[PDB]
Amino acid sequence: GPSAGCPRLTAAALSAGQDALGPSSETQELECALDFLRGSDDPALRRSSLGSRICLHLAERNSDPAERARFAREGVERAEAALAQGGEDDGAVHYYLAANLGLAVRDDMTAALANLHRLEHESEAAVKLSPDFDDGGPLRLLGMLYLKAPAWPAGMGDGDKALDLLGQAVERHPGHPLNHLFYAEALWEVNGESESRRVEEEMAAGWRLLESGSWGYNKQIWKREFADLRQEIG
């Protein structure tokens, strides 16, 4: 449960203050809130995406793959709990279920393939219910799945749908670094050398947002993803 040094907390205060917690929060602050809500019977909090989101913040800040996956697996459990308690209409619950599930499996091919249907279902639910959440996060997840899943007809993989969704994320939510990064990856992988200028400009814009914006402890893992695309394009 909450550690002994945590501030006094109530469900009402956590709900009212839920947006004061984020990627810039220190780990101790995030865990005080996460450990509290696991034990809370407050109907709203029990249905909320907050616990799953906190787990994703903790996953993203951990460079070790096993440690990151451990927190991501906790986020999957928190989102599943929220859905069982009545959060099914909340697009953010499905979003953080799919985002955490992705982190938990994407470094392991067997697990990624084994969870592709669940990822697809949850990413689609997020896109249906709250496509704009987290600056278009659900479009990011579903678009990347269209880019990375086994290619049609073997699976849902479809580069045109990837480009449609990730282009829509960039158009509708230009402030997020990963909308530009992921769109750039799709442009390169689906269209190749003919989109090099656009790929590069999208990378550069994402990097500028990454460097200037306030992404807290998400910055290091996103920087690694930017480097990955740089190396992929040569």
Numbering used by the authors: 27 to 260
The authors write:
The aerobic methanotroph Methylococcus capsulatus was the first bacterium shown to synthesize sterols, producing a mixture of C-4 methylated sterols that are distinct from those observed in eukaryotes. C-4 methylated sterols are synthesized in the cytosol and localized to the outer membrane, suggesting that a bacterial sterol transport machinery exists. In this study, we present three putative bacterial sterol transport proteins in M. capsulatus that exhibit remarkable specificity for C-4 methylated sterols. We first used bioinformatics to identify a cytoplasmic membrane protein (BstA), periplasmic protein (BstB), and outer membrane associated protein (BstC).
Finally, BstC is predicted to be a T-component member of the tripartite ATP-independent periplasmic component superfamily, which comprises periplasmic lipoproteins implicated in the cytoplasmic import of small molecules. The structure of BstC was also determined by experimental phasing to a resolution of 1.9 Å. Two monomers (RMSD of 0.656 Å for all Cαs) in the asymmetric unit form a dimer with 180 rotational symmetry. Each monomer adopts an all-α-helical structure with 12 α-helices in total, designated with H1 to H12; 9 antiparallel arranged helices (H4-H12) form an irregular ring with a pore running through the center. Three cavities are found in the center of the structure. TN1 is closer to the N-terminal face of the structure, while CA1 and CA2 are proximal to the C-terminal face and form two open hydrophobic pockets; TN1 exhibits a mixture of hydrophobic and hydrophilic amino acids. All the sterols were found embedded in the hydrophobic cavity (CA1) lined by Gly128, Val131, Arg132, Met135, Ala138, Leu139, Leu142, Leu145, Leu167, Met170, Leu171, Lys174, Ala175, Pro176, and Phe208, with the hydroxyl group pointing inwards and the aliphatic tail pointed out. The simulations reveal that the substrate moves approximately 8–9 Å further into the binding site and the polar head makes a hydrogen bonding contact with the side chain of Glu86. Mutagenesis to convert Glu86 to Gly and Trp to remove or reduce the potential interactions with the polar head of the sterols leads to ~4.5 and 100-fold decrease in the equilibrium affinity for 4-monomethyl sterol. Size-exclusion chromatography coupled with multiangle light scattering (SEC-MALS) analysis shows that indeed the purified BstC exists both as a monomer and a dimer in solution with a ratio ~3:1.
